[PDB]
Amino acid sequence: SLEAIVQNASSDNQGIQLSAVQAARKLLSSDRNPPIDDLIKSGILPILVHCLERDDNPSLQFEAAWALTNIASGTSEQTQAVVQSNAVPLFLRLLHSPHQNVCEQAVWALGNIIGDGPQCRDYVISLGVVKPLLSFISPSIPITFLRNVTWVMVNLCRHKDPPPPMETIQEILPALCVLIHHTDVNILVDTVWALSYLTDAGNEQIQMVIDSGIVPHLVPLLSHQEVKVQTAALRAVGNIVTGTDEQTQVVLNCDALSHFPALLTHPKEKINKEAVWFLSNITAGNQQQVQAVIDANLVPMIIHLLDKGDFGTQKEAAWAISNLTISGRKDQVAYLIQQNVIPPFCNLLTVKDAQVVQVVLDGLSNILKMAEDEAETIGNLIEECGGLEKIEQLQNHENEDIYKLAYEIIDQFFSS
Amino acid sequence: RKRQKLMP
């Protein structure tokens, strides 16, 4: 029974105690549906926490840390039960053990605890987990231990409400700079997911990432053979290019667009979608960045995805086309007109999603305004593909801005 | 986010 297990776990006979702790561990580590609540209610937590102190018996420490790791792998309530037992300070002490397995199990437990939430993460941070954790990174470390370390780093970087403290980001970025040159796929995926979480927390963290000097080694991963590495790298660089024009220009100066012909033609629709999202954030920039997209010969593929892509990729493609008008010259919009953007761009006006219809109407109106000399021919083009009927039906729409823009467009460029 | 250590 569990009662006997706890009582024996409190025994002064080392054999009885170790056997009890091992029985608990086995109860918590044999199946994917362990009995965590039963063990918590039994009162075993403080006993395991005490066992964490037994530096004389590395096996007892390892077994107790294993049990606590598996209790902390459940719901937030069970992880917080482990936290309330004062386990985190003793795990942080164990991080300095001379025994590799004990260190690794402490890292594992701390990773499960940090991943619960940002306040738990910040409690573990305030106690100084980051320096010991990152001190494990080395060539001599076993690859599985290093993967656990990188998983803990990822958990440290997730949650952006609040985001990790600035000092912690400054400590973690050099470790990521080191790890982004690793060959193991799992370490690369963890490193790049950590970078994606860090770059999704505002422009200041993006500038920190840029200053670390890691982007030149992040952009090449867009062409990695493993699709997980590609997805993570694309997320990270997309986040970066959601920033200012200068950060986007850093990304571009890393030769990023050269990687996108393979991303736009990728068989995975989600990769096409993320790539078109990146490109839409590129087209929302200055004239030279729009011209870089044009020179990379990516516009035809963007229009093809607008025409024949899944709805998400079509959303991002519509956003890219409409962003090009923000700062694009009339020459650069004429290039779009020559590439037959009007028909597939207008075919989106019937989608139920109101945001897409609004974006497409905005883009059409801006296109008609820019090309004053060719306004009539572009209106004829819009009418040949059945876009005029769509725009006129949109006069009966629910949203206010939608029918407002519809009436404005019809009056200005379809009456005259 | 969370990992259970299953006896390998």
Residue numbers in the entry:
A (entry chain A): 72 to 487
B (entry chain B): 361 to 368
What does the report in the manuscript say about this coordinate set?
Since structural data of the binding site of NF-κB on IMPα remains elusive, we tested whether these sites overlapped. We crystallized the well-characterized NLS of p5026 in complex with both IMPα2 and IMPα3, and found that it bound at the major site of both IMPα2 and IMPα3 through highly similar interactions involving p50 residues 361RKRQKM in which Lys362 bound at the P2 site. HB number of hydrogen bonds, SB number of salt bridges, NHB number of non-hydrogen bonds generated in PDBsum, BSA  buried surface area calculated in PISA. Overall, there was clear overlap in the binding sites of MERS-CoV ORF4b and NF-κB on both IMPα2 and IMPα3. Structural analysis of the NF-κB component p50 bound to IMPα2 and IMPα3 demonstrates that there is a direct overlap between the binding sites for this host transcription factor component and its competitive ORF4b inhibitor.
The MERS-CoV ORF4b protein has been shown to bind preferentially to the nuclear import adapter IMPα3 in infected cells, thereby inhibiting NF-κB-dependent innate immune responses. Our results provide a detailed structural basis that explains how a virus can target the IMPα nuclear import adapter to impair immunity, and illustrate how small mutations in ORF4b, like those found in closely related coronaviruses such as HKU5, change the IMPα binding mechanism.
